[PDB]
PDB file of C-alpha atoms in Angstrom:
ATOM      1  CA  UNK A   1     -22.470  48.741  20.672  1.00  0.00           C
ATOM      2  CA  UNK A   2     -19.945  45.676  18.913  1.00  0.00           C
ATOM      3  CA  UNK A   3     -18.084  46.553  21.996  1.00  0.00           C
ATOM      4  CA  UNK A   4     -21.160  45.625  24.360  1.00  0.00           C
ATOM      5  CA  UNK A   5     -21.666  42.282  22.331  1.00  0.00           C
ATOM      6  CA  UNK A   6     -17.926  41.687  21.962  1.00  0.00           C
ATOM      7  CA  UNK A   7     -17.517  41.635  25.884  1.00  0.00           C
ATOM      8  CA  UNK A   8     -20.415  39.974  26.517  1.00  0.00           C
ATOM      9  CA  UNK A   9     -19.121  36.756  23.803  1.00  0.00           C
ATOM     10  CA  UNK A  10     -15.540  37.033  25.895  1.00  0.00           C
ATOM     11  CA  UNK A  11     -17.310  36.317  29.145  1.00  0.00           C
ATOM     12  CA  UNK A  12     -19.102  33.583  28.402  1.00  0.00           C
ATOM     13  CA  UNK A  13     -16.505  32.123  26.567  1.00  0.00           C
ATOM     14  CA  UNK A  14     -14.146  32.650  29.397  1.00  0.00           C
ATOM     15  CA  UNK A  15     -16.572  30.937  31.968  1.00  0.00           C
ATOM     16  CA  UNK A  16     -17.391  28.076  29.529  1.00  0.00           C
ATOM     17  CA  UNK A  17     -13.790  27.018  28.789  1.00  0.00           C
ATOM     18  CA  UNK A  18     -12.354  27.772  32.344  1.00  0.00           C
ATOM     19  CA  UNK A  19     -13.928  24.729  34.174  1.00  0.00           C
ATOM     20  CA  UNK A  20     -12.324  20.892  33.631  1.00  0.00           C
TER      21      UNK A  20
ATOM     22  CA  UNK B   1      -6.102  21.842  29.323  1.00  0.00           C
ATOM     23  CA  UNK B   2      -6.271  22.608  25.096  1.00  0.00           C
ATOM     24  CA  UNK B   3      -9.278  25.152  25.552  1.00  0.00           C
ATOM     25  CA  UNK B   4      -7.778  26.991  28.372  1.00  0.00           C
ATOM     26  CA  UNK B   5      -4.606  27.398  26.371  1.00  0.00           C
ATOM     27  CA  UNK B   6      -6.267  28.079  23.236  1.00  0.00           C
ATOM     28  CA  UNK B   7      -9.061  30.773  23.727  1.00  0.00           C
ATOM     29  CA  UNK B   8      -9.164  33.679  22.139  1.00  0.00           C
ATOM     30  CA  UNK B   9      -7.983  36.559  23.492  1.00  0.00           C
ATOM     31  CA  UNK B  10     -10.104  40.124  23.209  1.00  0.00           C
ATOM     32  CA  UNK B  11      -8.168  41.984  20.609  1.00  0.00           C
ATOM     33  CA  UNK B  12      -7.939  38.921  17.948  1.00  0.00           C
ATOM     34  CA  UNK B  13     -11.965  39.067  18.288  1.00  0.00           C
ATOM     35  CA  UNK B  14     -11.627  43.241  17.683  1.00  0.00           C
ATOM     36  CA  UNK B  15      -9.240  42.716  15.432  1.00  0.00           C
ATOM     37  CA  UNK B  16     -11.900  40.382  13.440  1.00  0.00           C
ATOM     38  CA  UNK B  17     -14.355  42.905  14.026  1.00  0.00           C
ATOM     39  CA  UNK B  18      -6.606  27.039  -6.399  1.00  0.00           C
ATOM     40  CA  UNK B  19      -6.315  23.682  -5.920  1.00  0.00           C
ATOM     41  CA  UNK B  20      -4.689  21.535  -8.686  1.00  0.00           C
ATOM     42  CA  UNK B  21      -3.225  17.693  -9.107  1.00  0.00           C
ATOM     43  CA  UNK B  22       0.413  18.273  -9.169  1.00  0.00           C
ATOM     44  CA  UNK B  23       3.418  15.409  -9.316  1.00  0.00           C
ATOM     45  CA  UNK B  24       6.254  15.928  -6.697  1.00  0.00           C
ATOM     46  CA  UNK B  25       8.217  15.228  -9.882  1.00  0.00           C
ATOM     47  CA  UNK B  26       6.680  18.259 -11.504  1.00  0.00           C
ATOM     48  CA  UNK B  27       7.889  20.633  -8.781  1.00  0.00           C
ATOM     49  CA  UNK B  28      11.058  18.989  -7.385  1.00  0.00           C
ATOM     50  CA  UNK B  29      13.959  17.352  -8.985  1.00  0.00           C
ATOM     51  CA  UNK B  30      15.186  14.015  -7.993  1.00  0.00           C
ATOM     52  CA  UNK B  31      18.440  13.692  -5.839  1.00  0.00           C
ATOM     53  CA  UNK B  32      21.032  11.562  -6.637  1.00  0.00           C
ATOM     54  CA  UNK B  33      21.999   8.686  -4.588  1.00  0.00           C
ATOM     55  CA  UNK B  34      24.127   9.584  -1.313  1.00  0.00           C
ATOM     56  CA  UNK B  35      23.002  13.124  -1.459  1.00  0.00           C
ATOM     57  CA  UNK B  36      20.986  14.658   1.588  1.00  0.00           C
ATOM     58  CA  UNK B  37      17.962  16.244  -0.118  1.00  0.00           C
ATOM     59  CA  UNK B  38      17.426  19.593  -0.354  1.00  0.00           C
ATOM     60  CA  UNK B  39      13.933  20.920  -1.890  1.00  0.00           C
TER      61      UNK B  39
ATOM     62  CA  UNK C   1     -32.501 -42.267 -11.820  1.00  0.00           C
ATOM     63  CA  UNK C   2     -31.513 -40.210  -9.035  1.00  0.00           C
ATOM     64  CA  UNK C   3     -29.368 -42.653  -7.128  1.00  0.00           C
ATOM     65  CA  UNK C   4     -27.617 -43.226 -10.639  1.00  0.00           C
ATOM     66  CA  UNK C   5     -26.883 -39.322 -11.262  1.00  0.00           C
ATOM     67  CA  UNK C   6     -25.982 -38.850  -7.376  1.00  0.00           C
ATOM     68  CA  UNK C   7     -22.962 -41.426  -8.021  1.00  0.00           C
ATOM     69  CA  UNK C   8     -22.290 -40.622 -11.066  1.00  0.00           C
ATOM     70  CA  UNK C   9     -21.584 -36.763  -9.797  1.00  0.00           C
ATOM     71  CA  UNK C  10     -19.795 -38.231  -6.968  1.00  0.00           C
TER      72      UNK C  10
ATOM     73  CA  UNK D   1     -39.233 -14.481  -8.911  1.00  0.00           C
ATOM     74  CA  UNK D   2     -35.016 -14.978  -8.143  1.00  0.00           C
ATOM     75  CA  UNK D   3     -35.265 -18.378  -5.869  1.00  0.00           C
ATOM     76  CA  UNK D   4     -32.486 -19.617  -3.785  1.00  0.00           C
ATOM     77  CA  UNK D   5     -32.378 -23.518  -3.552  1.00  0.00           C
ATOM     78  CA  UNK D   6     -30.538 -25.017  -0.630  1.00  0.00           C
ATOM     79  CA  UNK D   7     -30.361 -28.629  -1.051  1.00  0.00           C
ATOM     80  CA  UNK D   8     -29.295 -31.353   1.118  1.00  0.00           C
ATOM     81  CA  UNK D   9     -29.165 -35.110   0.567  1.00  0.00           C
ATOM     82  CA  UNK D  10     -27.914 -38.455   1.282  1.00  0.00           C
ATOM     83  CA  UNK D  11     -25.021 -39.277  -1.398  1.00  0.00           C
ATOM     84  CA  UNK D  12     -23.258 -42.946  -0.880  1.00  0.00           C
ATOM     85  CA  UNK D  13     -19.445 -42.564  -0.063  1.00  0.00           C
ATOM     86  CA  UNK D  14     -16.916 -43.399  -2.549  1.00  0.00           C
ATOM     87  CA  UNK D  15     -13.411 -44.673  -2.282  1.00  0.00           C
ATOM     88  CA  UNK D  16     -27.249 -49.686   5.019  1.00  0.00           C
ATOM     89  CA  UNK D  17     -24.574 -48.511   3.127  1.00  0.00           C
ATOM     90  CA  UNK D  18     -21.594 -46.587   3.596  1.00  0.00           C
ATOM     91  CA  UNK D  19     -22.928 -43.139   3.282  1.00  0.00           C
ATOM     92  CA  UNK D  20     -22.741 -39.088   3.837  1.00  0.00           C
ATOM     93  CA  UNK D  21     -24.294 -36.176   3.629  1.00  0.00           C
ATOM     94  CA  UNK D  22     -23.953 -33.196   0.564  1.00  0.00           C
ATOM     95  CA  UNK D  23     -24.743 -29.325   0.027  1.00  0.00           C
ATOM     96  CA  UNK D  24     -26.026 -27.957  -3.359  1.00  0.00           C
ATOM     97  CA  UNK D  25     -27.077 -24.671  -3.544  1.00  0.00           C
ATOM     98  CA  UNK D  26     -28.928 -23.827  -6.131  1.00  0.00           C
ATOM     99  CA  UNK D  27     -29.766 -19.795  -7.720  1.00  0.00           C
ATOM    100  CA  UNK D  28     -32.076 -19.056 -10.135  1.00  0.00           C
ATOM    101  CA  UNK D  29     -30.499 -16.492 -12.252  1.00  0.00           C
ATOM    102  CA  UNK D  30     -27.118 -15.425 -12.985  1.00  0.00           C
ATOM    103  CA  UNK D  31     -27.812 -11.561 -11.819  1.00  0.00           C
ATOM    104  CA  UNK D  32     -28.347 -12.958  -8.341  1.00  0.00           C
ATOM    105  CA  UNK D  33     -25.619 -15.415  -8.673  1.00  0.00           C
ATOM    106  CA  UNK D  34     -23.519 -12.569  -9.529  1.00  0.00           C
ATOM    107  CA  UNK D  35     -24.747 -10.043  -6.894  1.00  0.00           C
ATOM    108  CA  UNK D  36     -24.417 -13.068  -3.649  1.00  0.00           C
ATOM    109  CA  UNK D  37     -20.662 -14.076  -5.759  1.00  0.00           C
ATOM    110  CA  UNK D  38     -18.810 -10.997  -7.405  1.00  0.00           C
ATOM    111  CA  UNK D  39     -15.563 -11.661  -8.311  1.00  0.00           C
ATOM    112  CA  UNK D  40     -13.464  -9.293  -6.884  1.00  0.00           C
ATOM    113  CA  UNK D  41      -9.992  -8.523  -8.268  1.00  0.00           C
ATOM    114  CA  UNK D  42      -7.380  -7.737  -5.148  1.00  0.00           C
ATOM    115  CA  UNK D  43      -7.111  -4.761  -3.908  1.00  0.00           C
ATOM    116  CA  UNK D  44      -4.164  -2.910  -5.277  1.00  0.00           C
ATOM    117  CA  UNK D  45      -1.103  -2.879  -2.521  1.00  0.00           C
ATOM    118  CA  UNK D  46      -0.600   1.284  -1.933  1.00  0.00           C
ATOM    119  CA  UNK D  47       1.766   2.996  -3.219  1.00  0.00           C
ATOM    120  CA  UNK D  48       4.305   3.972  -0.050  1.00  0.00           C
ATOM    121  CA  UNK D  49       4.558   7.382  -1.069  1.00  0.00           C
ATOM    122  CA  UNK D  50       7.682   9.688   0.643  1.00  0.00           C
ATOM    123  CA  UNK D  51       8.019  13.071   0.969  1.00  0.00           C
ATOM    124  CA  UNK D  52      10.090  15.477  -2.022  1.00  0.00           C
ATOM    125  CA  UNK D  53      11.475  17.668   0.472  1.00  0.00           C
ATOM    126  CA  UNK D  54      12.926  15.284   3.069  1.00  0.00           C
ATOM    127  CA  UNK D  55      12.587  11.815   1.714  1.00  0.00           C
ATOM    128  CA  UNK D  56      10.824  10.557   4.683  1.00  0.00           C
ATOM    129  CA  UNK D  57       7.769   8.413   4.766  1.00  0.00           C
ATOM    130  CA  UNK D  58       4.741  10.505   3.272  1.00  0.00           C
ATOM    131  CA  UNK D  59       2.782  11.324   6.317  1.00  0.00           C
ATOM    132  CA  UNK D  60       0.181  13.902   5.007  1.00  0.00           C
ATOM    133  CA  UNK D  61      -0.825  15.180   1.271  1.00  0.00           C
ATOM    134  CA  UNK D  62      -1.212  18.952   0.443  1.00  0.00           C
ATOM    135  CA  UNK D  63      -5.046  19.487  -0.367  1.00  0.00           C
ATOM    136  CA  UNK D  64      -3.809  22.383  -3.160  1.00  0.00           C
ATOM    137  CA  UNK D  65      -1.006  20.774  -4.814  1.00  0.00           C
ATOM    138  CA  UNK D  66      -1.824  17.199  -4.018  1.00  0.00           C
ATOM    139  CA  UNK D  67       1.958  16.538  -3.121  1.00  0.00           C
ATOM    140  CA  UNK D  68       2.829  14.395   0.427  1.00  0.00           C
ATOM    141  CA  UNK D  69       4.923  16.060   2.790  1.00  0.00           C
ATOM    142  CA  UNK D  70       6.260  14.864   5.908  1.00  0.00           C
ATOM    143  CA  UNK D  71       7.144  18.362   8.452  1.00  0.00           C
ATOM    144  CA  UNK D  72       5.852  21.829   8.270  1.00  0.00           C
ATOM    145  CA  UNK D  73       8.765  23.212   6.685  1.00  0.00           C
ATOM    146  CA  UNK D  74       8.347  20.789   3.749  1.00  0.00           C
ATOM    147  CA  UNK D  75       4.570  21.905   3.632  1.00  0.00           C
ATOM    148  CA  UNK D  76       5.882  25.980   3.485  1.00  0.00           C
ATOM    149  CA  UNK D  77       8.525  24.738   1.174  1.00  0.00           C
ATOM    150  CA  UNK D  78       6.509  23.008  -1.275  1.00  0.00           C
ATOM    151  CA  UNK D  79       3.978  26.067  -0.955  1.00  0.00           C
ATOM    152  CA  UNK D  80       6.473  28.520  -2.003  1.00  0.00           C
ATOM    153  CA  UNK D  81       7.348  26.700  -4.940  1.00  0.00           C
ATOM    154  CA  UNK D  82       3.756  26.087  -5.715  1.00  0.00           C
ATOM    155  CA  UNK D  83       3.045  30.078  -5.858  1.00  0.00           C
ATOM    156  CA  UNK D  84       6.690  30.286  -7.619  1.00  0.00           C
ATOM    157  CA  UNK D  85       5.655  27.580 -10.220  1.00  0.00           C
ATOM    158  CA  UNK D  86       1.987  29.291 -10.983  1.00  0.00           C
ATOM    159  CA  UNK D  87       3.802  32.776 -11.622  1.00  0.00           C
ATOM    160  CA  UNK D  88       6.068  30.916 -13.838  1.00  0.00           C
ATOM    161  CA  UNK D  89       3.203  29.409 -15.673  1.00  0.00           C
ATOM    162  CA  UNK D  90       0.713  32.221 -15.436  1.00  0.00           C
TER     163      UNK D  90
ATOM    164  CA  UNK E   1      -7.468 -17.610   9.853  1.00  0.00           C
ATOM    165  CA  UNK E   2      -5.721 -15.406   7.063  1.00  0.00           C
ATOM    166  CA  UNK E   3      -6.052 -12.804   4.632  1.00  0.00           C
ATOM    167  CA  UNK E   4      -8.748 -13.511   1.768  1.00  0.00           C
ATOM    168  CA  UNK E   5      -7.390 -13.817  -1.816  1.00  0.00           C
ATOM    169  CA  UNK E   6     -10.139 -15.824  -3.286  1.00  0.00           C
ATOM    170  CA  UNK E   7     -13.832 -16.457  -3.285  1.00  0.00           C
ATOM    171  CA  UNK E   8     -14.438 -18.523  -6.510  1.00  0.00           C
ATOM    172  CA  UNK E   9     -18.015 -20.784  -6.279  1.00  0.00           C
ATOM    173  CA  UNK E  10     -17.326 -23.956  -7.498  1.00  0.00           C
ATOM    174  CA  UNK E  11     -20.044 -24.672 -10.400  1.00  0.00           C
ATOM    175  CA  UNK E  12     -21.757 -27.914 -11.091  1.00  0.00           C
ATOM    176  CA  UNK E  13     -24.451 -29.807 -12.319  1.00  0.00           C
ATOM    177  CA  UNK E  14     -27.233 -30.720 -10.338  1.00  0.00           C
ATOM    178  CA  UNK E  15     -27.833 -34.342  -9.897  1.00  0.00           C
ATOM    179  CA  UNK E  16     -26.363 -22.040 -11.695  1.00  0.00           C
ATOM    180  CA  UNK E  17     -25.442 -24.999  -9.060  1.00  0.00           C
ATOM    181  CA  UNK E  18     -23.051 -24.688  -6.491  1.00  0.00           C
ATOM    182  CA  UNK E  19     -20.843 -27.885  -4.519  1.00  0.00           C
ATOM    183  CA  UNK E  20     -17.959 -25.998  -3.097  1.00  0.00           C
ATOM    184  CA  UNK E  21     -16.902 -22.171  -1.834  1.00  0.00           C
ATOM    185  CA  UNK E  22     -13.397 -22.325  -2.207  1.00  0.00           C
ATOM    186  CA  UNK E  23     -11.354 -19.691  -0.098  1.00  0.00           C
ATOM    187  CA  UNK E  24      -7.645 -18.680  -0.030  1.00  0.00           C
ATOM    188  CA  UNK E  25      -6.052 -17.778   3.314  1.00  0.00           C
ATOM    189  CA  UNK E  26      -2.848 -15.763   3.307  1.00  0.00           C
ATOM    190  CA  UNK E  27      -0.401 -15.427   6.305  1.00  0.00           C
ATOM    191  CA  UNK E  28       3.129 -14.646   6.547  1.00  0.00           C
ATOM    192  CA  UNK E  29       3.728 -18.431   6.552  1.00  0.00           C
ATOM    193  CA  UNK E  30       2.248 -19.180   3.243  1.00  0.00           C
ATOM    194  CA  UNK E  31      -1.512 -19.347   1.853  1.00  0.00           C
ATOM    195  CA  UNK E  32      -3.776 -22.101   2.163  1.00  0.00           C
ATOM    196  CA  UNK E  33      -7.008 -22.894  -0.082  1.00  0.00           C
ATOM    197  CA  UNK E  34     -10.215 -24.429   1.607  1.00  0.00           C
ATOM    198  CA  UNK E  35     -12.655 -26.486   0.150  1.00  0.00           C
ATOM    199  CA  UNK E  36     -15.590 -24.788   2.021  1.00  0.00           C
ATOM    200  CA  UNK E  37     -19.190 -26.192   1.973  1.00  0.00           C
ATOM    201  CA  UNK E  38     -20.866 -23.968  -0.039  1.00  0.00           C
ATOM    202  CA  UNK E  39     -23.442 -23.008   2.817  1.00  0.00           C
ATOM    203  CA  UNK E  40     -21.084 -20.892   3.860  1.00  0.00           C
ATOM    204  CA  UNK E  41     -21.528 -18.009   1.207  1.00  0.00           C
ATOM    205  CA  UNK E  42     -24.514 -16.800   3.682  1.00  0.00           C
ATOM    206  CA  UNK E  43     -21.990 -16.251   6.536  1.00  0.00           C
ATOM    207  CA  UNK E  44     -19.594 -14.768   3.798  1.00  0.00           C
ATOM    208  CA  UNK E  45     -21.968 -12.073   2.911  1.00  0.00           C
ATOM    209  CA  UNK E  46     -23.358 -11.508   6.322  1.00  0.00           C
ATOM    210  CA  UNK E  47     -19.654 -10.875   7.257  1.00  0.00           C
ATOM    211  CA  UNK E  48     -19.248  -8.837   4.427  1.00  0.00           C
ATOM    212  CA  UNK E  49     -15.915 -10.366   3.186  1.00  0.00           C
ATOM    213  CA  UNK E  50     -13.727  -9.237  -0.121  1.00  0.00           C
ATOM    214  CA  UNK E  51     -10.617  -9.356  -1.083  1.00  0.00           C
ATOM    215  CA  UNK E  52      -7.752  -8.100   1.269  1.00  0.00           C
ATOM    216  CA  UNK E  53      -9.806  -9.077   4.417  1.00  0.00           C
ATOM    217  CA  UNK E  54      -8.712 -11.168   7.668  1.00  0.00           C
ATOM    218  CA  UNK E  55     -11.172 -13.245   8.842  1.00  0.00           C
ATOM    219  CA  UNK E  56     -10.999 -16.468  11.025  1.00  0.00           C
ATOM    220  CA  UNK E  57     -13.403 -19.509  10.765  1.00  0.00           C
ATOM    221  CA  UNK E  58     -13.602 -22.186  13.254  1.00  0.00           C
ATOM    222  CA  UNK E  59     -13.604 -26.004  12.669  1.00  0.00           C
ATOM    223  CA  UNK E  60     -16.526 -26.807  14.769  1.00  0.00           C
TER     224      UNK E  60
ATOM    225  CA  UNK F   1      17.452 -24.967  -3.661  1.00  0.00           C
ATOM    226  CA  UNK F   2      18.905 -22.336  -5.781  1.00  0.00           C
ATOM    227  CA  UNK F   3      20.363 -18.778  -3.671  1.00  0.00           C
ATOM    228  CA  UNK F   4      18.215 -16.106  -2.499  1.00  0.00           C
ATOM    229  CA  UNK F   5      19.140 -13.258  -4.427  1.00  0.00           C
ATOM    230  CA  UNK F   6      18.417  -9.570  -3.517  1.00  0.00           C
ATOM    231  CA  UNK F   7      16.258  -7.339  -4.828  1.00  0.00           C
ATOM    232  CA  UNK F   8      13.344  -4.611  -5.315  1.00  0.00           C
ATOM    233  CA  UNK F   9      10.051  -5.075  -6.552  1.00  0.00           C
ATOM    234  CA  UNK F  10       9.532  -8.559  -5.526  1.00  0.00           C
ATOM    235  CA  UNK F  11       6.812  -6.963  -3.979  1.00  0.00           C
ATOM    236  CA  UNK F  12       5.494  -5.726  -6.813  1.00  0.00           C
ATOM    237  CA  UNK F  13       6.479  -2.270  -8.544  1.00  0.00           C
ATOM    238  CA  UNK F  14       3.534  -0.293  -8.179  1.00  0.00           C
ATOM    239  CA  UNK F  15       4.221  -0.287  -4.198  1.00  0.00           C
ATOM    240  CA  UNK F  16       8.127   0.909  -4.094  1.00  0.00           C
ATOM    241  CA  UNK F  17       6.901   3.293  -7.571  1.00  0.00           C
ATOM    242  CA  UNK F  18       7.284   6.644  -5.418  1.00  0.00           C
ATOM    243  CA  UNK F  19      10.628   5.505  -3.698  1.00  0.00           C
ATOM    244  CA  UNK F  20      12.150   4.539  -7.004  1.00  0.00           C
ATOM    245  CA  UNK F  21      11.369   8.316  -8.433  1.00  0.00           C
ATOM    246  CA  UNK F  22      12.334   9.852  -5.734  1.00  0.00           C
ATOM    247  CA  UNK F  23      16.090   9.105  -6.066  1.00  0.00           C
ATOM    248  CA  UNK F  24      18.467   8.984  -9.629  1.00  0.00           C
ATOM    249  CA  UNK F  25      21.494   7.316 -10.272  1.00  0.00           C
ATOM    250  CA  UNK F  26      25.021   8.046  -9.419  1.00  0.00           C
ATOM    251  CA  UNK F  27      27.131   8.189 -13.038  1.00  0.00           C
ATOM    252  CA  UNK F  28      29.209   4.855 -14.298  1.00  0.00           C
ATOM    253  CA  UNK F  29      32.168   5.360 -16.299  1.00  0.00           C
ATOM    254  CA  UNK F  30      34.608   2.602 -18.766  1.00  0.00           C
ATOM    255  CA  UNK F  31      37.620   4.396 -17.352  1.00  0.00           C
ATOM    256  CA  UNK F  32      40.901   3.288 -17.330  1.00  0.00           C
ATOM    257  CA  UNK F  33      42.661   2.442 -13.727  1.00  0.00           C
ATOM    258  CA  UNK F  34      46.345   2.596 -12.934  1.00  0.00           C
ATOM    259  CA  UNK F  35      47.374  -0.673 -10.798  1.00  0.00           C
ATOM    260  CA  UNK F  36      50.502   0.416  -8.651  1.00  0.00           C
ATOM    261  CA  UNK F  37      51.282  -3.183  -7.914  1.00  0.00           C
ATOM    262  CA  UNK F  38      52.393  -3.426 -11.600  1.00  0.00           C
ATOM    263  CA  UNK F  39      55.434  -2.290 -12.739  1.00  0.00           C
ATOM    264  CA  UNK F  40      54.928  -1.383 -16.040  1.00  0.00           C
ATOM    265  CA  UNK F  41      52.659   1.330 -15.902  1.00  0.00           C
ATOM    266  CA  UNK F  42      50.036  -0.317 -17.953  1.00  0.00           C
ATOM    267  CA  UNK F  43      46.178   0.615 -17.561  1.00  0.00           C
ATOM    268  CA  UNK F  44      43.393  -1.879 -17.820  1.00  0.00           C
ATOM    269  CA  UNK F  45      40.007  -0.359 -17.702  1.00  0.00           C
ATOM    270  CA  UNK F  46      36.826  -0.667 -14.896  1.00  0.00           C
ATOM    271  CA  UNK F  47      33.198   0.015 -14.662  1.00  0.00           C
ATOM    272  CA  UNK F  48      33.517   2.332 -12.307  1.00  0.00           C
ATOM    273  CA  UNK F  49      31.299   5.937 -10.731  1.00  0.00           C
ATOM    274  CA  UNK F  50      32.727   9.148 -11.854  1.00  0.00           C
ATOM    275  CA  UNK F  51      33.813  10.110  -8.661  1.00  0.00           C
ATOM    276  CA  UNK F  52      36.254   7.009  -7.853  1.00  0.00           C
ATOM    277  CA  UNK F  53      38.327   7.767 -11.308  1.00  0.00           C
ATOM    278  CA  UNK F  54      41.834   8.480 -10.834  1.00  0.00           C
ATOM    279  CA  UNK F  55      41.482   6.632  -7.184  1.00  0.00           C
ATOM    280  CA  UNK F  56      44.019   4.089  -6.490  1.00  0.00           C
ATOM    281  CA  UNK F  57      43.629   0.678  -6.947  1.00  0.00           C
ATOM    282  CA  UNK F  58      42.091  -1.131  -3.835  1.00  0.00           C
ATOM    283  CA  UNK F  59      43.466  -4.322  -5.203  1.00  0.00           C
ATOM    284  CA  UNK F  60      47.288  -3.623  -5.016  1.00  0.00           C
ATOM    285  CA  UNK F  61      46.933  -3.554  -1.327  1.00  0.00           C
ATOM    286  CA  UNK F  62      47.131  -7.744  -1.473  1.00  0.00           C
ATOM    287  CA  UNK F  63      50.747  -7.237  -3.339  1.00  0.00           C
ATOM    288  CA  UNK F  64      53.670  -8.112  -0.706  1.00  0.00           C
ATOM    289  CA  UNK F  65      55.851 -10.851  -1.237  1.00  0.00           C
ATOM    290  CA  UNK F  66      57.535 -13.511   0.864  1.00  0.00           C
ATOM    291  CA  UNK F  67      60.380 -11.837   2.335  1.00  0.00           C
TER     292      UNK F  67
END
């Protein structure tokens, strides 16, 4: 389930350091 | 701009999933005057 | 006293 | 307890009267005089430190080897002869 | 206004007593020592001065 | 007022300390020069590097004579 958790951290991540 | 460029990527995050007081004189030797250093 | 010990310093 | 005098008086000027005013502050003990006075030797002028590799002023210091550098191929430079020097040594 | 090289209280007897703070400003000019009156060592330590400071005091 | 001569250190040493070991010395020899402006051959002897023996004599450049 690290894969489940792993995509879950990427996501958020991804949304959180998209916006200036 | 430095986060965008810099986040990590999905497979570094799978892929996750002797100090001592030297003298530059110690290591390296001195060049003569007029010479381009070397190391 | 004083007075004599005031110039005296100055 | 420590006491702190300041003082303040007529004095008569040298070469009513001609006169001005003087200051004398006044401590109690010479600890306090000490702490409110230390006499502090200069600071030391730096030494302007240059890099081995290059000979160009010292712009960072290795935390291992404790050796200034000045690009990043000094810093792999000096870190292969660090790890060369240790085998040497033991 | 300079650089601080000095701080030596000027000892005395009262008519430890102090009659003088003397300071020594460096520029690039050349240095300068000022007979300060010594009610000045309060600013001094409020200011937090040593050795190898620049400070400035004014006349007035 | 007496000259202004150069120098290091003036400073203080401790300051120019790392610049000083950085660097060594070229070698100075008491070699023996040929001057081409003499005829005889004779050789008079210089402080001088290693590397500038057996280079000819700046000196001799001067010698011409009034035609």
């Amino acid at each position: 389930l690290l894969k489940e958790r792993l995509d879950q951290i990427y996501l958020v991540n991804e949304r959180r350091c998209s916006q200036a | 701009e430095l986060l965008s460029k810099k986040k990590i990527p999905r497979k570094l995050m799978e892929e996750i999933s002797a100090a001592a007081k030297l003298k530059a004189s110690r290591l390296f030797q001195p060049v003569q005057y007029g010479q381009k250093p070397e190391g | 006293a004083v007075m004599t010990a005031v110039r005296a310093w100055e | 307890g420590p006491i702190i005098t300041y003082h303040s008086v007529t004095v008569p000027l040298v070469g009513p009267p001609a006169r001005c005013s003087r200051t004398f502050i006044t401590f109690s003990d010479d600890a306090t005089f000490e702490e409110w006075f230390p006499q502090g030797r200069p600071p030391k002028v730096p030494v302007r430190e240059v890099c081995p590799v290059t000979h160009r002023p010292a712009l960072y210091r290795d935390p291992v080897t404790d050796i200034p550098y000045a690009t990043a191929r000094a810093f792999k430079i000096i870190r292969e002869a660090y790890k060369k020097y240790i085998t040497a040594h033991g | 206004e300079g650089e601080v090289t000095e701080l030596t209280p000027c000892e005395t007897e009262n008519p430890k007593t102090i009659s003088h703070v003397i300071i020594g400003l460096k520029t690039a000019k050349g240095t300068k020592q000022l007979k300060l009156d010594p009610s000045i060592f309060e600013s001094l330590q409020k200011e937090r001065v040593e050795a190898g400071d620049v400070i400035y005091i004014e006349a007035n | 007022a007496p000259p202004l001569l150069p120098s290091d250190t003036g400073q203080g040493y401790r300051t120019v300390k790392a610049k000083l070991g950085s660097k060594k010395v070229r070698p100075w020899k008491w070699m023996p020069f040929t001057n081409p402006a003499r005829k005889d051959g004779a050789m008079f002897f210089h402080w001088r590097r290693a590397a500038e023996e057996g280079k000819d004599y700046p000196f001799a450049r001067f010698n011409k004579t009034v035609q």
